[PDB]
């Protein structure tokens, strides 16, 4: 369905 | 549509979470992990350094507690 | 990064450990401790804080091995 | 000159 994506990177 | 789930803006979350500090940005790793569910979408690749949230699979009250935390450390 | 160890990555994969492997993060450190480290166990809060750039590059390789090997 | 970890039960 409904989705937010987020890479937290180093 | 996407972008706001229980009354937390999910892309300013996300934006917050760009300004913490390196280890601030640590605590945001482990209040995730350790108040994981199996509905929430969570990967940490370690070998890479990247940890990988889909912030709408969080549970309300989760992500009231990460947001208050970005506003309390940016 | 101190040595050949990224410590974000290594704090990154320090979270992903299980609780039962983390007492062996406790015990490595607590086992290597030197005056320079800064190494904090506050048993009855059951917290344990550590300044990554205060450990030397030794442990901070046997962490990072450890790490990767458990996760 | 920092980096801190808190690991916590």
């Known amino acids: 369905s409904?989705?937010?994506?987020?890479?937290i990177r180093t | 549509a996407?972008?706001?789930?229980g009354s937390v803006d999910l892309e300013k979350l996300a934006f917050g979470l760009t300004k913490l500090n390196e280890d601030d940005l640590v605590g945001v790793v482990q209040?995730?992990?350790d108040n994981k569910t199996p509905e929430?979408?969570?990967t940490n690749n370690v070998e890479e350094?990247?940890?990988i949230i889909d912030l709408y699979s969080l549970p309300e009250?989760?992500?009231k507690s990460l947001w208050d935390y970005?506003?309390?450390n940016t």
């Open chain 2, 2 to 5: 996407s972008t706001v789930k």
């Open chain 2, 49 to 51: 350094g990247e940890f």
């Open chain 2, 40 to 42: 929430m979408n969570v």
């Open chain 1, 2 to 7: 409904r989705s937010f994506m987020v890479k």
């Open chain 2, 61 to 63: 009250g989760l992500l």
């Open chain 2, 70 to 72: 970005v506003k309390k």
């Open chain 2, 31 to 33: 209040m995730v992990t």
